[PDB]
Design a binder for this molecule. Structure first.
Ligand SMILES: NC(=O)C1=CN([C@@H]2O[C@H](COP(=O)(O)OP(=O)(O)OC[C@H]3O[C@@H](n4cnc5c(N)ncnc54)[C@H](OP(=O)(O)O)[C@@H]3O)[C@@H](O)[C@H]2O)C=CC1
Ligand SMILES: NC(=O)C1=CN([C@@H]2O[C@H](COP(=O)(O)OP(=O)(O)OC[C@H]3O[C@@H](n4cnc5c(N)ncnc54)[C@H](OP(=O)(O)O)[C@@H]3O)[C@@H](O)[C@H]2O)C=CC1
Ligand SMILES: NC(=O)C1=CN([C@@H]2O[C@H](COP(=O)(O)OP(=O)(O)OC[C@H]3O[C@@H](n4cnc5c(N)ncnc54)[C@H](OP(=O)(O)O)[C@@H]3O)[C@@H](O)[C@H]2O)C=CC1
Ligand SMILES: NC(=O)C1=CN([C@@H]2O[C@H](COP(=O)(O)OP(=O)(O)OC[C@H]3O[C@@H](n4cnc5c(N)ncnc54)[C@H](OP(=O)(O)O)[C@@H]3O)[C@@H](O)[C@H]2O)C=CC1
Lengths: 337, 347, 346, 337
């Protein structure tokens, strides 16, 4: 029912579209795609992906301003300035802002002007914007919000199981470090950048960069304000990343008790979001994983009874997209006028 | 003696500056760089390089626009429009245009309008009025008064030409094809994203990527005799630097054997091409050619003639360093032959 | 209908088992594996694969030596000396020798002595008395009673042969050279360490590595007419799988054009080589050929004739999957026609 | 003055030999090299390295059982069983055991039998063996010890700055995670291994493996027994690794105070071992670094006043070798018999 528009047909743009195609009876409906690239570009890359692999569906370049996916036709436009996009003309109810530039009130807004009704930012919001992490506080949402951010790929992982911890052992304080696959943001070869680290090789180094997911947790778990904070390491992998949380709780606890708690929630409340895995695996073994976070049980370890460390895997691309969809999936429900 | 500017402080441009620094006593003298990032972004990257490794020398940030390599200052400006450049004010004699954008007469010449005397493009010209030179081959063909805009060809073409010559000039090249397993480059996407060439748009780091290349045809530009006889493709493979060419031209001459073809190189190597060509008999691998001053190196043990007429060669060349080194020789030339004597895409 | 054993549970052997599982109804029936690691090490790696991705099916560990793929059991033994193998006891009809060690008559035959009926080597034979087949080319040449030890050639040779044929058989191949940008392989060092070939001893992951290859010559083994006319090298590049060949043979025929050379393939592709050859006109890259059932795929837009006589082709082939798929066809055949040094780099 | 024998001319074997060639007036003197590989193998790989780059020196294959380095001649033998090596015949005073197999009393001992006097194990010792980390307790050494281990590449990094912490803020407890380059130990392609993780792709994954450096710290810093423990992540890089320590100290402290302390020690006592770096760099920027550990100051962060996180780089190959040499450099001094 709910008409959707994908702006920024990049990795999350496409990982999303596809994430969608796989859902059954989706309140969402993609109708237009806006990306600096021509219909050719949109077709090819939606069909041939170097990380998700060739898309199982018939994808042809039907039209001069459209592409076809199993028959469902979609228009492809291209204006580097949103205001122009015919969101109003096409009655765009929701826009999936995955460009990486329009992350602020001012920017995301240009979509509203174009005639769009709502703008889901596929990234953390800059400034005063509603941030929601499906599984951590989606009930906070109200059809009243015109601009929401579905947080970062990291936060969307770290959050779910942080809630589980605090909500059970009480997080006093704690740092975290996310060994992360690289992203479009990094330079393929030592080239200029505003982050002289991110500006480096990307594929030949462990690139320490900073992440907001640290304080962003607090954004959705008000309780942890200023209790968490960490950095990130960009290692030579195109996808799937791991977080290394280290919190100090009040209630003395032990290894398996922690994991247990996780499982319990993963089987009840967080079913579909969090999950545990005992089988000793590795990065690649976590591609296309519909869940936001996956605890590597056998790794979890406690110290001095109150210092807990938890490792957790997550597909920064797919898993996130599945969340983005789940959020938009929500906007479609609890939508009045 | 001669004042030099470097427009484009990236890989090739920085590889340049490096090449130039630790040198005999080049008549060249870099006094300005145009890196759209300031002294910070321009310094850092000159000091710490992922492919060349930390630069060996005190590099400090003086002024708010004037870093220094061991005391010697280098003023640094930044503007996408050459016209606004202080070439005249500073009195720039040579400009190393290493951006890959200004490669046509009109463009690269914008530097002259700014007050530049001569412009060297670190890539093939898109025009036709611009001379393409390849040290080792036809460098003599360059003399003052003859065009104030030249192109040091391609990294590939500058690796091919040299040994392509010795082949035809001492065996007669009928015609042939060629391929080049090439280290990925900045023009490629890091991860699958929009790009005018749906091949370069694929993860440069996880694919063997086929992409056209003129480097083959352009050989003629320096070796007319071959005009329209060579040709080929290129394959991008997950290797940040150092590449190899796979030439397959069926010769005109008799039907010589393998190891003699080599000897020709070996001969022309320690002779006329002493500094350009070379033959390495010891079985190594790409990484062993990092920082190689030779514009081309043949893998002895790889050469092999098939049907008496068909010869096959394989050469090694560092695309960053090597080329940059020639680019400093070609700019070294300009100075030795200078008076005092006689739909815009990609990203 | 026919009991099969798999000696060597690594890449090619595992790629085999997988290929075989999700199949129409192969007469083959894997009942035993010989992975020097037990049910654990042999299971895990069948379920989770870095290049094929988590195997889609319930794989559980029954017994202490008998895992099961969706209920169907598979007994697993382990011993470096085939002679000690229970081939006879179990009554093994075919053995997929995928270790890369037993590739000579004396060796691979040790399986017969243990009680094996027929042995298929997943690599080129080092002997001369062993037949080299390449589905699509000369598979007919195989008939029961004719040697109980065959070789499914090389990954490269099985990619070349097919389209090499169509070239000579419909244009006449004078002779030519070839190169193959090849995904690194197990025989290479991870980091610079001792290895009988100072090229393979270099970091497989950070070098373009030149290494000899007979795959070129061996074409003859299936296509006699070419005997001693082809040849070439190989280049290892940091890419875990999927490779490309660069053939440059100056033809005998007229001086045909590019796009027609192609048409021959295209013709012979949907015709006699329907399942082996194929031509992809859409500009893709290596990663797009993962899990490709075709023994060879030509990049249309890459083909190009130079001097009327010199033709140049480029083909795409998944070295793991593709080959393994043929190896299941060649084992599928057997059944349809049924009544210094020693070590050296491990 | 001290005759040395390199057994296991692998990465640490060669990284060492070369590390040595660069030292001025070295009490050490290499005379024999034992590795499964022929004189060819020893030459080539000592000259052409894919990580240290071609060796600046003339390296030829002089002899049927020797190689030459700038004239200095060295014998190359090859027996998979130590006992045979002519250590006694050549009067081998010290053996640099870098094979990865002879790490126990029984094993390393076969060297003693061959006629060798001492055995320096280029790895952690298994069982009851003297473990010393140059800069952390080399004074514990005594010419009495016939078999010593120079700990692991990780421990040799983590130790130095742990001492600094505890010795100043008092480490109560703390975990750590080391994002580590891969090593000869990993499988290049999913192949059998006793560690089904290490058995995976290596270059395509973040491979969680376990490390002893956790408890090994205590080995050399008796005080921290059972206070530290962590895991490790093998990421796609051939060299240089980073450690992510997270200790809880008693004495409340803040960001820059910690770093300060580090610098102080790095300028005085640990001068040559530890060191700080403010210039925002990345992996590759730390090749050939003579020091054991290097603190990434700008990354150091504190929480709730007592939870300290410190990131630290280190060249698991070179820097370690330089330590190995420094240890052997010591055995030569304070050597009586
Ligand atoms: N990569 C990941 O793992 C994750 C990313 N995200 C977030 O999702 C967003 C997208 O990230 P990612 O997909 O990785 O990035 P990409 O660069 O892959 O995708 C962004 C796309 O938007 C296009 N684009 C840029 N500007 C415009 C414009 N003005 N109008 C139309 N199209 C435009 C870009 O084209 P061009 O580059 O040519 O301008 C590109 O195709 C970011 O907010 C990111 O933080 C969230 C979770 C995970
Ligand atoms: N790398 C190699 O081995 C070879 C490359 N070449 C060619 O040389 C050229 C440069 O290659 P490479 O060194 O890899 O590229 P880089 O990306 O390293 O360098 C290009 C530089 O130009 C800057 N720049 C971009 N646009 C402008 C502009 N409009 N005005 C001023 N400066 C600008 C870029 O900054 P920013 O990115 O921020 O826009 C960057 O600093 C290309 O044509 C390439 O094909 C030739 C032979 C070999
Ligand atoms: N990978 C590919 O794309 C292609 C490979 N091939 C060829 O097929 C062969 C196998 O290749 P690949 O699958 O990559 O190799 P793998 O390493 O995956 O498989 C070889 C297997 O044999 C086992 N093994 C080793 N020695 C013995 C022994 N003495 N007795 C019993 N089992 C043993 C190995 O165990 P362990 O390692 O523990 O000793 C391993 O499980 C090689 O000849 C290769 O050249 C042919 C075409 C393509
Ligand atoms: N890699 C690193 O970063 C670090 C490693 N170390 C330690 O140093 C040791 C060596 O590690 P590393 O250098 O990485 O390993 P390598 O595998 O690179 O080196 C060991 C070498 O010894 C050879 N070898 C094995 N057995 C014999 C034998 N019986 N006789 C002669 N030669 C033999 C091996 O050949 P082959 O494999 O064919 O048997 C190999 O060439 C291990 O203890 C390791 O834990 C310490 C710090 C860091």
């Amino acid at each position: 029912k709910l008409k959707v528009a994908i702006n920024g047909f990049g990795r999350i743009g496409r990982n999303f579209l596809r994430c969608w195609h796989g859902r059954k009876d989706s309140p969402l409906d993609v109708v237009v795609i806006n990306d600096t690239g021509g219909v050719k570009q949109a077709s090819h890359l939606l069909k041939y992906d170097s990380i998700l692999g060739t898309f199982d569906a018939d994808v042809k370049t039907a039209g001069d301003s459209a592409i076809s996916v199993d028959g469902k036709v979609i228009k492809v436009v291209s204006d580097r300035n949103p205001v122009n996009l015919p969101w109003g003309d096409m009655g765009i109810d929701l826009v999936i802002e995955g460009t990486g530039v329009f992350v602020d009130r001012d920017g995301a807004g240009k979509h509203l002007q174009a005639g769009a009704k709502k703008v889901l930012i596929t990234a953390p919001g800059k400034g005063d914007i509603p941030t929601y992490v499906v599984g951590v506080n989606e009930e906070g949402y109200t059809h009243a919000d015109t601009i929401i951010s579905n947080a970062s790929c990291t936060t969307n992982c770290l959050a779910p199981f942080v809630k589980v911890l605090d909500q059970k052992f009480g997080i006093i304080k704690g740092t975290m470090t996310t060994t992360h696959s690289y992203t479009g943001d990094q330079r393929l070869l030592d080239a200029s950048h505003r982050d002289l680290r991110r500006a480096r090789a990307a594929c030949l180094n462990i690139v320490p960069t900073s992440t907001g997911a640290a304080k962003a947790v607090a954004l959705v778990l008000p309780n942890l304000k200023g209790k968490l904070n960490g950095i990130a390491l960009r290692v030579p992998t195109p996808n799937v990343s791991v977080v290394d949380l280290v919190v100090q709780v009040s209630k003395k606890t032990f290894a398996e008790e922690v994991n247990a708690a996780f499982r319990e929630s993963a089987d009840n409340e967080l079913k579909g979001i969090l999950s545990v895995c005992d089988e000793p695996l590795v990065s690649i073994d976590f591609r296309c994983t519909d869940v936001s976070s996956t605890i590597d049980s056998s790794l979890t370890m406690v110290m001095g009874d109150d210092m807990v460390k938890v490792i957790a895997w997550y597909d920064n691309e797919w898993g996130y997209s599945q969340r983005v969809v789940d959020l938009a999936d929500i906007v479609a429900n609890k939508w009045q006028a | 003696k001669l004042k030099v500017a470097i427009n484009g402080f990236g890989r090739i441009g920085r590889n340049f500056l490096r090449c130039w620094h630790g040198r005999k006593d080049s008549p060249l003298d870099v006094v300005v760089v145009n890196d759209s990032g300031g002294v910070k972004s321009a310094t850092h990257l000159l000091k710490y390089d992922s492919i060349l490794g930390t630069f060996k020398a005190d590099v400090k940030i003086i002024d708010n626009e004037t870093f220094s390599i061991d005391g010697k200052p280098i003023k640094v400006v930044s503007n996408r429009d050459p016209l606004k450049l202080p070439w005249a004010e500073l009195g720039i004699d040579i400009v190393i245009e290493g951006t890959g954008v200004f490669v046509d007469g009109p463009g690269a010449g914008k530097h002259i309008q700014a007050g530049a005397k001569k412009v060297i493009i670190t890539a093939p010209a898109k025009g036709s009025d611009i001379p393409t030179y390849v040290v080792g081959v036809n460098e003599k063909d360059y003399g003052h008064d003859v065009a104030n805009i030249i192109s040091n060809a391609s990294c590939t073409t500058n690796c091919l030409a040299p040994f392509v010559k010795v082949l035809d000039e001492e065996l007669g090249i009928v015609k042939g094809t060629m391929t080049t397993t090439h280290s990925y480059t900045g023009d490629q996407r890091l991860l699958d994203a929009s790009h005018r060439d749906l091949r370069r748009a694929r993860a440069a780091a996880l694919n063997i990527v086929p992409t056209s290349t003129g480097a083959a045809k352009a050989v003629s530009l320096v070796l007319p005799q071959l005009k329209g006889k060579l040709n080929g493709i290129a394959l991008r493979v997950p290797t940040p630097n150092v590449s190899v060419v796979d030439l397959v031209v069926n010769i005109e001459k008799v039907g010589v054997t393998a190891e003699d073809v080599n000897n020709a190189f070996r001969k022309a190597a320690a002779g006329p091409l002493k500094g350009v060509l070379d033959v390495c008999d010891i079985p190594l691998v790409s990484v062993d050619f990092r920082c190689s001053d030779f514009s081309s190196t043949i893998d002895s043990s790889l050469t092999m003639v098939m049907g008496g007429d068909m010869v096959k060669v394989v050469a090694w060349y560092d695309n960053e360093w090597g080329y940059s080194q020639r680019v400093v020789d070609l700019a070294d030339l300009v100075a030795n032959k200078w008076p005092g004597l006689e739909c815009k895409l990609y990203e």
